[PDB]
Symmetry: D3
C-alpha cells in the first residue's frame, strides 16, 4: 500500500556547451540504473531542477542549451525508465514552440517509457531567471502505490498557492525539484513541511548539491509526511540518496476521515483570480 | 524603531456561570497592569482565544455566556489598556446581533481605550465549534512602532490564505490567538513560521495553557521573524509570558527589496473567488 | 486501518489512606469519560504506573494500600471502559495472593469491560521498589485497529529483552506505563525509540507528571513509529494528553519485508538461570 | 585517566581489482601515521567496514578480493600501529580456511603490533551479503586507558543482543564499524545511543562516507557516553575525523555503584536452544 | 571520584510579610530532607535566588523582608544541612550592617552546619534591582567529591569575567542561582555552557519557576560539562529536580593536560572602565 | 539599514611551494568576483585563516611561505576588492620586519582598495603554532552599513576577553577567521554565540573546510545576532557560501537602550601578573 522513492542530490552541473549537456544525460541515465540496482524496490526517482543543463546564465537561453519536450533527450530518459521499471522526474529547459522565451519544464515518465506529466514552471523570479511563466497550469498524474503525483519547480514551493492547487486537483504527493543556493536552506525545509501539512499531502523535495563556481547548492533531500513532519532529511553533499517509503492511501484516508459558507472572504483571492493582484 | 510585545499563555478558564466569566475579566485586567509594571517598555499584550469565557461546550452558546462587541466587558478592557498605555488583543464570544449563531471575535484596543480592530473568526474549527463564519473579512489597523496589525483566530492560522490576506492588506505583523489542544502543537509551530516567511511578516501567536478537564491546551507562545525563524518560544505552562522586540520597518524594507504575468494559473483560486471551491 | 490512542500524563498522587486511593479511581474514571468526549475516535487510553495508589513508600505495601486483580477497583475501571467504549490500561499495586511481597501490576480492559491482559512487573526498580518480580511472563492480547498489544512497566523498558519478548510473541504495539523521576528523562526517550526500531514495533509510553514532595515525575508521553522515530512528544506538565494515530498493519507489513546456533553466552546463561556479570 | 580515540569516516572504496585494494591498504597506513601526527595523544584509531576491499558485489568473494587473517595485509597494518604506537581497528574480508563462504572480519592491533582481537561478523544479512555467520563469538580484549574493547560490524549493532554480549563479557567500550547507506542514518545514531545506555558502556562507531556509484555512505562517526548521550557527532563528508576522550573507569564505576534468577523471556530460551522461530 | 547534586526549580514565592518568609524557610528545609531521602547519595542541593524571600518589589528592601547573614534563618538552613548531611546553597536578601542598601547574598553550608562560603551579588540586575554591588569579591570553598565551589547570582553569569574569576581562584564547579524571567531563557542556557567551556569548569545553574503575578520564572536547571556540553536540562515546571553526577578531578585533569593587550582589562583594573 | 555578508568555507590549501600560494591567491581573487556576481548586494566577503598559505607546519615559517603586509599579495586582494566594490577579509602569515618569529595576520580592505584594518593574532597557541603574539592590540575600523568591524583569529574567539575588547573599542560586528579541525566544532559554535550576546554584537565566523591529509577542517560558517542567536549555519562542505543580512544599527540601539574592579584576574592580567 506504499512505494519507495529515491531523491538524488545531484551534483550541480557546470555546463558550457551541448557536449556537457549530453554528459549530464548519460550520468542521469547511469544514476537511474545504478540506484534501481541498489534499491530493488524503487519506483520513483527524482532529479533536481537544472540537472540536465545547469545554470550557465550567459548561455542557458541559447539554442545550443535548449531542448524540445518531448525530444531526443526525454526519449533517452524514457528508455532508461522503461529498462529500470521506475517512474522518473526530470528537468529540461524547453525551447518555446512559438519562438518566444523558453520554459523551465519538468516531466514524469512511467515504467513503460510514457511521459505522463509535463509541467512548466509557473513562478520564475524573474530578476535572474529568463523563463516564461508556465502556461500548462499545475497538472496531476497517476503514480505508483496509488499516488496522485504533481511536480513544482524551485520557487513554486515558496508560494502556498502551488501546493494548494496540487492537492485541489487530487494530488496526494507533491514533488519539488529545485536548484537553490544555500541562502534559503532554512526556508526550503520550512515550506516543504507546511506545503505537506496544509494540504494533508506528502512532499518529496530535492535540490542540486555542490559548488558550481558561483553558488553552493544545498541538496538536502527531504520527505515530509502529510502531517508536516519530516521523515528523512539529507545533508549538503553531492550524490546523497534520500529514500523513503510513502503510503499515499494514508493521506487519502486523512482527508476523507478528518453546509458551510462557500463565499470567499479574501480580497487577494479575488484580485489574483482576476489578474488585478497588486 | 521597534516595539515590545508580551504574549500571555493564559490558563484555560473553567467556566460554569456568568460569575466565572466576570472572574476572568478581572484576572485579564490584573494581568494587563501587572505585565506593564514588569515590562515598562511594553506596548502590545496578547491574550489567547476563549480567555474571557472558556470552552464550556454545553453552555458557550447560551445568552449568559455571550457578550456584545463592544460592550461592558470590552469597555473594562479598554479602561485597562488606557491606564496601562498599551495595545491589547482580547477574545470575546460575541452574541449575534440578529439572533443567529454567535461569532468568535477578537478585538484590538489602543492605548487610548479605542477599539481600532474587530475581527470575527473566518474559519470556525468545525465540527466541534458552533461559531458562525466571520463576515468582516480580515481587517488591518495601525499599531505600535510603525506596525500594521492583523489578528486571526486559532484554526485561521492553518490556512495560508489567512496570512496571505493579512499581508495583502498591508499588515507587517500577524497576531494569532488560539485555544488549541496538544494534538496540533507541532502544526501550530510549523504554520506560525510559514505564515511569517511566505509573506515577509512577523507572527505573534499564543495559545491557552493548562487543563480544563477535557483538553490540555499547549500555550507555547511564539514569535517569528519575517524570514520564518522562531525568535522566542514558550513551553506549555500556564502564565508563561513570551516577550520579544519586533521591528516592523525591517519587514517593510524586506518587502521592497515585462511587468509580470497577471493571468491566474490556479483553478482553486478561480473557484474560491467564484464561491465554488469544491 | 489504524486507531487513535491517548496517553495521560496523570498527576502523581499524594496518597496517605484508602480514601485517597478511591479518590484516584474517581479521577481516572472521570478522565476516561472526558477524554473520550474530547476525542470521539479514541480507542486506547493509557494511564501511568502508580496512577491509582501513588508512591507512599512508607505505606505502599500495607494491606490498606493494595488491591486484588481483578477486584472492585478494576471492576470500576472496567465499567468506565464499557460505558465509553475504549480499551484502557491501568496500574494496580496487587496484593500477593500468598501473603508475600506485592506485585506491580498492569491490566488492559477492552470496550466491553473484559480484562484481556494482566501483567506483573518483571524488573522491579531495585533497590527502592519492594515489588516481587512478575511471574506471568510478558503477555500479548488483541487490541483496536488490528493491533497486538503488550504492556510493560517502567524499568522494564530499559531492558531490550522486554521489547524483544513482546514482538517475539506477536505484539506490534508496546505500551510502557511509568512512574520515573526526572533523572532518567533522556534515557526514557532513547529506549522508547530503540524498543520500537529494533522490533519494527510501535511504542506508546507515558509517565506520571508533577511533584509528590520527593520526586518530580517527568510525564513526557511519547509515541514512536516502527522505524524508531518519535511521532508525538509531551512535555512535563500534569494532565498533558498525548494523542496519536497508530497503524499496526504498517508494522506488520514492515516485518513481512524482513545461523541457528547461539553465539551469545549471556543468552545461554540467562536461559539457564545463571546470568552472572 | 582516559584515552583519545579517532574515528575515520573513510571514503568508500571503488575496487575493481587487487591493485585498488592495495591502494586502500596504503591509504589506511598513511592515515594511521598522519592522524597520530595531528593528534599526538591518540591511542585508538578506528576504520569502517569494507575500508580495505570496498563493496564490489560482483567480485568481493573472488580469491583476488580476499585475504587471510592474519596475513601480509594485516602485517602491514601491524607495522603502522607499531610505528605510530596506537591501537588500530581494521576491516578485512577473510578467506575461509575450510573453503566455503568467506567471513566478514574485524581485527584490533595494539601499539606493539600484536593482533589482540579477531572477530567475524555474527549477523551478515543473508539477502545482500555472502559472508558466513561468524564462529568466534564476540571477543573482548584489553585496550588503552583501562578500556575493555569489543568490536561489532554493521548490522550487528542493530541487535541489542550484540552490545549486551560485549558488556556481559566485560567490555566497557564497544566499537562499531559499518558500511551503511544513508537509508539507516537515523537508526544508526539511535542504536549507538541505546547500545551504550542499556549496558553502561561507551560506544565508538563510524561508517564509510561518500558515493561509490550506487549508494551514498553517511559516515557520521559517533561517540556516546555510558548514559546514552552522544558526545561528538560527525557529518557525512569523506575524511572527517571524529575524536573524543573516553574514560572507561567512569563506566566501570557506574556499573559497580548504582534476586530472582529465572528467565521470563521465551525468546531467550528459544534463541539459546537454536529454536528461534 | 564524583558527587551527586540536585538543583531545585523552586516555586517563586509570593511574600507579603515575614511570616511568609518563615513559610518558605519551612518549605526549603522540608525539601532538603525529602530530596536527600529520595536521592540517598545527594551531596549538594541548590536553591534559586529569592527562594527565601521572593520578589515583592514594593517591600523587599523593608527591614521586615531582610535578614542578617548569618542569622536565625541561615541557622535553620544549617541545622537541616547537618541533619541530612549535605552541602546546601541558599539565597538571602541581606540587611546592610551599616544601614545602607541591602545586599543580594548567597551562602554555602557544609554537611556539618558550617557556613563555608558567603557571597554578595557583584552585578545587581539594574535597573529593576536595588541591591548594593557585592563587596566580598568571588570566594571559593572546598566542596564534596574533590570540588572547589564558587557561587554567582543571576546577572553575574552573563559576565564572562565572573566565571573567569571563579576558575582563576581555583574553582572547578561554578554554581549559579537565579531568579530570571522567561525573557532570557535562551541567553541563560548559552552562558551556562560558555562559562563552563571557557574555563574548563562544571556549571550547575538553577532558576526559580512559576508565576508570581508579574513574571514567569523559567526554572530550567542546567548542568554543563567542562567542555561546554549540557548534560542535564530541566523544563519550566515548579518543583522540577535536576540531578547529575559531577567529577571535579576530570576538570582538573583537563586544565593540567605576558603583557596585557586589552584596553578594557587595563581600564577595568584601574576602575576607569568607560 | 544593513549590509549583506558572505562567508567562504574555503577549501584547506595543501601547499608545498610558493607556486601553490600564488594559486591560492588567484583562487581567492576569482572567488571574490564570482561571489559578488552571484550576490550583487554583497558588501563584505570573509575568507578563513590560512586560506592564502595553508598549514604546512614543516615550511610555514620559511621565507618562501611568508609575505609582507601590505605587500604584492595584499595589492592583488586590494585590486580585486576594488573591481568588485566589496570589503574583503584575508589571512596572511606575515614576515616579521624585525627578523623574529613571523606573525599570523588578518587584514580588511575596503571597496576602494584601501587596507583599513591590520591585525596580528593575539593568542597564537604556543605548543603547535609558531607565530609571535600580536603586538597591534585589537583594532576596529569602519565597515559597510554603519558597521564597526573587528577581526580576531582562530583561538582568539575562545577567549571572552577578545570579543569584549572589540565591543569596548566600538565594534558592533566581530569577524572570526579560523583554521580549526573538527575537534572543536561544538565549542566553535558555542563561543561565537556567547561572544555575540555578551557584548550585544554580531559575530561573523568562518573556518577552512575539507581534508589536508592530517585534519578535517569543519567550515561551518556562522552568523549570530546580538542576542546570541545563530541566524545562519553552514555545514562542513568545502565551498559552502554562508550569507546573511546584518543590521549594525540595531546592535547599537540595543546597546543604547560602583566602578572599582572586584576581579583579581583582571588586576593580575592588566599587570602581567596573571598566573
Amino acid at each position: 500500500s506504499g512505494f519507495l522513492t529515491a531523491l538524488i542530490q545531484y551534483p550541480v552541473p557546470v555546463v558550457e556547451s551541448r557536449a556537457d549537456i549530453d554528459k549530464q544525460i548519460q550520468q542521469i541515465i547511469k544514476t537511474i540504473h545504478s540506484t534501481k540496482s541498489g534499491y530493488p524496490g524503487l519506483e520513483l526517482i527524482v532529479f533536481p531542477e537544472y540537472s540536465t543543463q545547469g545554470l550557465n546564465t550567459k548561455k542557458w537561453t541559447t539554442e545550443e542549451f535548449l531542448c524540445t519536450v518531448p525530444g531526443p533527450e526525454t526519449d533517452l530518459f524514457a528508455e532508461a525508465c522503461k529498462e529500470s521499471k521506475v517512474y522518473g522526474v526530470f528537468s529540461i529547459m524547453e525551447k518555446n514552440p512559438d519562438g518566444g522565451e523558453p520554459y523551465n519544464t519538468a516531466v514524469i515518465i512511467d515504467p513503460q517509457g510514457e511521459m505522463i506529466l509535463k509541467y512548466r514552471k509557473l513562478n520564475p523570479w524573474v530578476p535572474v531567471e529568463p523563463w516564461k511563466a508556465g502556461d500548462l497550469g499545475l497538472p496531476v498524474c497517476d503514480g505508483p502505490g496509488g499516488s496522485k503525483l504533481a511536480v513544482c519547480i524551485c520557487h513554486d514551493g515558496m508560494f502556498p498557492e502551488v501546493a494548494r492547487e496540487a492537492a485541489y486537483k487530487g494530488a496526494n504527493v507533491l514533488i519539488r525539484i529545485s536548484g537553490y543556493s544555500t541562502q534559503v536552506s532554512e526556508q526550503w525545509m520550512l515550506t516543504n513541511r507546511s506545503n505537506a501539512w496544509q494540504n494533508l499531502m506528502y512532499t518529496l523535495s530535492v535540490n542540486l548539491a555542490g559548488y558550481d563556481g558561483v553558488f553552493y547548492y544545498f541538496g538536502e533531500g527531504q520527505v515530509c509526511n502529510f502531517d508536516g513532519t519530516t521523515l528523512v532529511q539529507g545533508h549538503r553533499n553531492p550524490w546523497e540518496i534520500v529514500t523513503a517509503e510513502v503510503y499515499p492511501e494514508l493521506a487519502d484516508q486523512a482527508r476523507l476521515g478528518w453546509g458551510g459558507v462557500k463565499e470567499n472572504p479574501y480580497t487577494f483571492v479575488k484580485d489574483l483570480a482576476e489578474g488585478k493582484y497588486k
